[PDB]
Every structure is written in structure tokens, then in C-alpha cells.
């Protein structure tokens, strides 16, 4: 376990040195300054540029994508903390990717279970859309009986973070005093789902075209409508299911989006 | 009846086709007679800018130009592509980029040696790394019966054909003994 902690410290240090190099050859520090002046909260990186300076990070970022991406976003937060500009945004800062994918450029027909857990880039036509809806992230409560403030965090399978918790909404103190929600301090995020189908120029003749489901959050919501031709970058993942303690072995799969073109 | 010694690959059709390719280049204004573009290249007027006349020329002709000239690397050998191929070339379709990949690269190095020694050395290092990443895959791929060698360069095709020939011979000898 401690070796895993040491490796994560090493990986975050490598990404932090790449981001906040003393004379930045790739100018991502100046792009961070532009991002914080504009009030945006995600940074777009060239995977081909990471590939030159840290190829052992870049090729591992495709196969072991979850741990590498978590380490990269932690390094981005430390790089922001070194600035003289202040972190206004209550949601964290995020990363999207562009570049050369090769093996992992796919279609809804060719996305199959060998690719689960990997970063992928996929193409198609938007065929459905949910309306934008708000989702709880953290809740802040005031205890009037004791003048203390309680907080709670929430997590879900559709989020990149693997960690899980009880997800019960708190109502009482440990001393069973009642609690009051602070709506001005609790944190929510915008949420949307959609689906993409094969392009009609590529689907083989006679057969029905195949399709894939997609999840988008925060600034990526409210960007698409039906009929749009899109290229989408994200992690391909699987979702379990339960009914009365009996589980069918057939699970559902989605793409958790990082970036849209 | 007099004899002239020439190159060891004088009669090679593949080498003649490799010499027949052309690259993008630029010539200084007024340092060469503008009859040249109609005489050699068949172009009525050169395209002109502040840097010089900009054209494409073949390699056999470019070796004869003892005057000043300059070279721009083609798309398949540009520096971003050099970084991509040096990063991972193990499964890329080199024949889709260029059917005479390594040969045209070696010609480009010999031409660029006088203009840009650092760029010439960088491209040579890239070529060595690219071939080292792929030779084992070629020699392994030759042993399958269903392989057809779609993606390989003309240089890599020789190794592929020799491997498939050896596999056919040993399988024919083995299947006598049933």
C-alpha cells in the first residue's frame, strides 16, 4: 500500500514538473493563467505533447487511464495553488485531451469489451438528448442547537472517482439534534446524458446501425442537440445492477466524457 | 568496346522509381536562369515569394544542382510525424504514407547534410529507431498462413517474402511424413 502511495507521489510530481516547469516550453502555465482570467475550469492538453517529454506516462495513460488521470488532476490543483491568482471555483479543476490515438480510435460497432477501462475516441451522430438536470455533490448543514457546521460528500458509479459512501442525506446530529440545510453553501453540478449512432457512410449495408450511451457533466453539458456529427473522448466503463440480491450477469456500459469536438 | 564502371544498383527498377520521386524545394531569385522551369520541369512561370522560387523537383535532378537551393521536408517526414513515429511505429501503415519510406529518407539526409546537419542527424536517428521497432513483428508475421503483408514498406517486403518462402518449404517437407 505504501509503495502505491510512493508511486502516486512520484507520478503527481512528474506531472507537476511538466505543468510548472521553470521555463515552460509548452506554455501550459500561460494557458492556466488564461483559464483563471476567463473563469473556466478545465484545461485541454495535447497527448502527443505529453508523449514527447513523458512517453512512459503517455502510453500508460491509455492502458491504466483512471489512476494516471487522477494523478494529473491533482498535479493541476497544486500548480494552480502556486499562482498569485485565487481559486474562485467551488468545483475542482479538470483536464481534457487531444492528439493521436491509433488503436483507440473506434466506432459504436467496434467498441467491444476488450476496451473496458481504457481511454477512447469515438465518432458518430447524436440521436437523443436528456434535458440538463442538477445533481448533488456536497451538502452543508447548520446545527442550531450547538452552532456547529456539518458537511457531507457524495459519490456515484458514473463519476471517475472509484470511491463509494453511504449516500444517505443527513438529518440529525450525532447527539440527535436536528439540522438545517444551507442551500447557499451546498454544491451541485449540471448533468446530461445522450446517445450516438454509427455514421451512415460507414454502417454496412442492410444491417441496423449500432449505438453507444454517453454521460457529460459540468461545462460539457448543454453543448449538443440531435443531428450533430461529433467526435467524443472519454473512458469506456461498465455499470453493475441489482434486484432483491439477485444479479443478472449482463451489465450496461457507457462513455464518461472528457472532451467533445 | 569500352567499359564504364557504375553503381551496383544501376539496373534496379525499384531504385529507378525511388529516384523518380520529387520533393518540395526553393531556389534563389535571379541566381538561376528562368528557362530552367520550362526546360526541366515543364512549368511556364515559377511561383515566387520573398524567400525565392517555390517548386517541386525530382531527386535525380536535385543531385545535379551545384548552385544554392533549399529543401522543405514532406508531410510524412515532418517533425511532428517524426515524434509520432519515434514514439510508436510498431503497428502503423507505412505504405499508406510512402511506398519507398526508408529510401526517400536516406536521400533526404544526403541532400540536407549541407544545409542543416542537425536536422539531417535527427532524421537519421528517427529512421534507425523506426526500423528497430518493426523488424521483429515482420519476421514473426511471415509465419502465419493468412498474412498478406498489406502495410509494409518496399524495404520491409523483402524480409517478409523471404520468411514466407522458408515457411512454405519446411511445411511441404513435413507433410510428406503422414
Amino acid at each position: 500500500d505504501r509503495a502505491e502511495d510512493a508511486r502516486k507521489q512520484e507520478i503527481t510530481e512528474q506531472y507537476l514538473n511538466f505543468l510548472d516547469n521553470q521555463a515552460d516550453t509548452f506554455h501550459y502555465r500561460q494557458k492556466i493563467v488564461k483559464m483563471m482570467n476567463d473563469g473556466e475550469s478545465r484545461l485541454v492538453m495535447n497527448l502527443d505533447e505529453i508523449r514527447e517529454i513523458l512517453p512512459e506516462r503517455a502510453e500508460g495513460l491509455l492502458t491504466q487511464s483512471v489512476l494516471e488521470m487522477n494523478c494529473l488532476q491533482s498535479a493541476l490543483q497544486m500548480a494552480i495553488n502556486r499562482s498569485d491568482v485565487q481559486a474562485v471555483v467551488k468545483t475542482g479543476f479538470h483536464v481534457g485531451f487531444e492528439g493521436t490515438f491509433g488503436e483507440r480510435h473506434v466506432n459504436p460497432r467496434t467498441l467491444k469489451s476488450s476496451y473496458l477501462g481504457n481511454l477512447v475516441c469515438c465518432e458518430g451522430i447524436v440521436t437523443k438528448c436528456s434535458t440538463v438536470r442538477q445533481k448533488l455533490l456536497t451538502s452543508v448543514h447548520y446545527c442550531p442547537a450547538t452552532n456547529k457546521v456539518l458537511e457531507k460528500k457524495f459519490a456515484d458509479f458514473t463519476m471517475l472517482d472509484t470511491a463509494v459512501t453511504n449516500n444517505n442525506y443527513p438529518t440529525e446530529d450525532e447527539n440527535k439534534n436536528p439540522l438545517e440545510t444551507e442551500f447557499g453553501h451546498s454544491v451541485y453540478k449540471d448533468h446530461q446524458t445522450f446517445t450516438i449512432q454509427e455514421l451512415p457512410e460507414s454502417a454496412p449495408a442492410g444491417q441496423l446501425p449500432r449505438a453507444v450511451d454517453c454521460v457529460a457533466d459540468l461545462d460539457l453539458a448543454d453543448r449538443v442537440k440531435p443531428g450533430d456529427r461529433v467526435r467524443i473522448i472519454g473512458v469506456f466503463r461498465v455499470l453493475p445492477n441489482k434486484q432483491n440480491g439477485v444479479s443478472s450477469g449482463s451489465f450496461r456500459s457507457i462513455i464518461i466524457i472528457n472532451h467533445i469536438q | 568496346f569500352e567499359i564504364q564502371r557504375v553503381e551496383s544498383k544501376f539496373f534496379d527498377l525499384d531504385d529507378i522509381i525511388a529516384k523518380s520521386d520529387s520533393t518540395s524545394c526553393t531556389f534563389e531569385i535571379g541566381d538561376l536562369n528562368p528557362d530552367f522551369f520550362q526546360e526541366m520541369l515543364g512549368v511556364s512561370k515559377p511561383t515566387q515569394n520573398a524567400d525565392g522560387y517555390g517548386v517541386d523537383a525530382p531527386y535525380w535532378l536535385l543531385e545535379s544542382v551545384r548552385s544554392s537551393f533549399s529543401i522543405q521536408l514532406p508531410k510524412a517526414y515532418s517533425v511532428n510525424m517524426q515524434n509520432v513515429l519515434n514514439a510508436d511505429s510498431k503497428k502503423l501503415n507505412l505504405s499508406g504514407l510512402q511506398q519507398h519510406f526508408y529510401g526517400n529518407g536516406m536521400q533526404l539526409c544526403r541532400l540536407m547534410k549541407g544545409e542543416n546537419p542537425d536536422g539531417a542527424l535527427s532524421l537519421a536517428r528517427c529512421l534507425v529507431s523506426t526500423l528497430t521497432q518493426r523488424l521483429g513483428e515482420i519476421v514473426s508475421t511471415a509465419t502465419h498462413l493468412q498474412s498478406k503483408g498489406e502495410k509494409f514498406d518496399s524495404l520491409e517486403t523483402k524480409v517478409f517474402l523471404e520468411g514466407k518462402r522458408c515457411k512454405e518449404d519446411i511445411d511441404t517437407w513435413l507433410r510428406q511424413d503422414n
Side-chain angles (χ1 to χ4, degrees):
Chain A
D1 308 356
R2 302 185 177 92
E4 315 297 306
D5 298 337
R7 203 184 313 111
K8 286 177 183 183
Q9 287 147 25
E10 180 168 42
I11 291 160
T12 50
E13 183 167 60
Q14 286 161 352
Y15 284 135
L16 177 55
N17 278 271
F18 166 66
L19 287 168
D20 198 24
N21 201 5
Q22 182 168 66
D24 193 3
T25 58
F26 297 102
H27 317 287
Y28 283 110
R29 181 160 67 213
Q30 303 193 358
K31 292 173 180 178
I32 283 164
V33 171
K34 282 195 182 182
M35 175 184 71
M36 292 200 291
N37 274 266
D38 299 329
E40 299 182 358
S41 65
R42 86 172 56 243
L43 179 64
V44 177
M45 303 185 186
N46 279 330
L47 183 65
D48 297 350
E49 285 173 18
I50 309 176
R51 184 167 265 147
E52 298 170 10
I53 192 73
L54 294 153
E56 77 284 5
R57 289 290 138 260
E59 312 307 323
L61 181 53
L62 303 175
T63 58
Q64 203 71 8
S65 60
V66 175
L67 301 180
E68 290 272 19
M69 186 147 50
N70 289 343
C71 288
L72 178 56
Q73 296 200 3
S74 308
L76 176 57
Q77 186 167 27
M78 280 181 282
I80 284 169
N81 282 7
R82 285 179 181 176
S83 179
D84 63 328
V85 182
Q86 281 67 47
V88 171
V89 186
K90 290 178 169 62
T91 314
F93 292 90
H94 302 289
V95 178
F97 295 123
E98 287 182 336
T100 304
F101 290 95
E103 300 178 338
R104 294 109 212 284
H105 189 88
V106 282
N107 288 287
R109 180 167 297 267
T110 59
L111 267 175
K112 286 170 178 175
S113 65
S114 58
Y115 286 114
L116 286 165
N118 298 165
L119 189 75
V120 291
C121 166
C122 182
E123 297 182 297
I125 285 168
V126 181
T127 54
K128 286 200 301 181
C129 264
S130 169
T131 60
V132 178
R133 282 169 290 161
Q134 280 73 39
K135 195 169 181 173
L136 178 62
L137 186 54
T138 77
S139 61
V140 179
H141 301 263
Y142 179 67
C143 190
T146 64
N147 202 26
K148 280 187 175 181
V149 170
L150 178 140
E151 294 191 334
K152 197 172 187 171
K153 305 175 181 177
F154 293 84
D156 184 43
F157 280 8
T158 62
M159 291 170 62
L160 180 62
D161 187 14
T162 186
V164 67
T165 180
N166 295 290
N167 292 0
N168 295 324
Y169 198 83
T171 47
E172 276 83 25
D173 194 12
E174 295 179 11
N175 315 283
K176 303 192 175 183
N177 305 304
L179 299 175
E180 171 180 332
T181 302
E182 292 277 10
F183 294 110
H185 298 328
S186 303
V187 181
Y188 289 78
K189 57 173 181 174
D190 302 309
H191 170 72
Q192 195 181 16
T193 56
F194 55 93
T195 62
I196 55 170
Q197 193 178 98
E198 296 184 78
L199 296 171
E201 294 83 7
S202 299
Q207 302 188 2
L208 281 168
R210 296 181 175 181
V212 165
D213 302 2
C214 302
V215 178
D217 287 354
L218 293 166
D219 59 315
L220 304 174
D222 203 12
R223 280 201 191 186
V224 293
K225 68 176 182 176
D228 298 337
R229 286 186 180 236
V230 286
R231 182 179 289 180
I232 285 163
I233 297 97
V235 175
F236 186 52
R237 209 178 179 185
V238 63
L239 303 169
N241 189 19
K242 291 199 299 178
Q243 286 187 49
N244 302 341
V246 180
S247 175
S248 178
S250 55
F251 298 152
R252 189 172 163 254
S253 61
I254 56 168
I255 301 183
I256 297 164
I257 296 180
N258 293 0
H259 182 45
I260 305 176
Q261 289 185 346
Chain B
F1 190 78
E2 191 173 322
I3 281 166
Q4 177 186 26
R5 280 284 202 172
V6 292
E7 310 171 38
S8 75
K9 302 177 180 177
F10 179 79
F11 294 110
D12 194 3
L13 306 185
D14 287 6
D15 183 78
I16 290 159
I17 290 169
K19 285 286 191 185
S20 301
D21 287 336
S22 295
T23 181
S24 297
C25 50
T26 288
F27 300 88
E28 282 75 25
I29 292 156
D31 290 353
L32 178 56
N33 186 8
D35 291 335
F36 177 85
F37 306 103
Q38 181 62 72
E39 176 83 307
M40 293 286 110
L41 312 180
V43 164
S44 60
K45 295 177 184 179
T47 77
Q48 194 168 343
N49 51 54
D51 305 297
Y53 306 129
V55 282
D56 305 335
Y59 290 106
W60 66 262
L61 179 63
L62 282 156
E63 282 196 296
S64 70
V65 183
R66 294 187 175 190
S67 307
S68 59
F69 66 101
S70 56
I71 290 163
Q72 293 114 35
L73 284 173
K75 171 185 175 183
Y77 305 96
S78 60
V79 183
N80 290 352
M81 192 68 82
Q82 292 185 29
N83 296 340
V84 168
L85 298 177
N86 193 38
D88 194 2
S89 61
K90 193 171 176 175
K91 298 176 185 180
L92 297 177
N93 178 21
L94 292 183
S95 74
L97 303 179
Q98 175 51 241
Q99 203 171 16
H100 288 75
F101 188 87
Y102 300 92
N104 286 11
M106 288 187 268
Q107 293 295 284
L108 283 173
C109 289
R110 295 173 208 176
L111 290 182
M112 277 168 61
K113 184 173 174 177
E115 301 180 37
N116 189 5
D118 313 86
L121 178 58
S122 308
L123 184 53
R125 287 176 169 171
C126 182
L127 292 171
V128 176
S129 172
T130 311
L131 184 59
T132 313
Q133 289 172 22
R134 290 164 63 87
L135 273 183
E137 180 70 13
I138 292 154
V139 177
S140 177
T141 306
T143 61
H144 318 325
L145 293 165
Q146 297 193 356
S147 297
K148 292 191 182 188
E150 307 282 1
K151 298 171 178 177
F152 300 124
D153 194 58
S154 52
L155 177 134
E156 302 171 340
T157 301
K158 302 185 179 182
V159 180
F160 178 78
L161 289 176
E162 183 72 8
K164 208 167 190 189
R165 194 189 60 80
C166 291
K167 190 71 173 76
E168 286 182 15
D169 176 61
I170 196 68
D171 284 354
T172 309
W173 182 75
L174 285 172
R175 287 186 289 101
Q176 296 174 15
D177 305 322
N178 300 343

